[PDB]
């Protein structure tokens with residue numbers, strides 16, 4: 001991954017321009033972002049990914065770093081994505097799950 005700013009994370013798995021897409025999170029996604037310090041209603045996708053990563057780590061949903069699975073069936077995140085678990089390595093899949101929870105500007 002790459003970190004172009006102190007509040008953004010990017011990946012070579014997704015086109016660079018796509019990660020600059022402006023989005024307005026729906027209520028659940030927005031709540032998760034603000035719980036780790038986000039202070040706005042519109043974000044670029046790379047910012048959303050940063051804050052959601054912060055949420056995941058703060059909630060201890062990725063304690064086992066060598067296995068690349070996030071376990072979230074009992075967390076708000078599981079309800080948001082509609083899955084009990086997912087791989088942190090499958091970036092298109094993650095983007096897809098996030099897109100379902102926002103409006104693209």
Ligand SMILES: CC(C)(C)S(=O)(=O)C[C@H](C1CC1)N1C(=O)[C@@](C)(Cc2ncc(CC(=O)O)s2)C[C@H](c2cccc(Cl)c2)[C@H]1c1ccc(Cl)c(F)c1
Pocket residue numbers: 001003009010011049050052053054056057062070087088089090091092094095
């Ligand atoms: C290190 C930090 C800057 C704090 S991080 O990158 O934000 C940590 C984070 C951990 C919480 C899951 N994470 C990951 O750990 C990454 C490194 C997971 C991997 N992707 C690919 C890997 C090896 C490979 O190329 O096969 S390892 C990179 C992974 C990532 C980065 C950028 C975009 C996407 Cl879609 C995913 C990132 C992450 C971000 C957000 C969500 Cl919702 C995730 F499920 C995963």
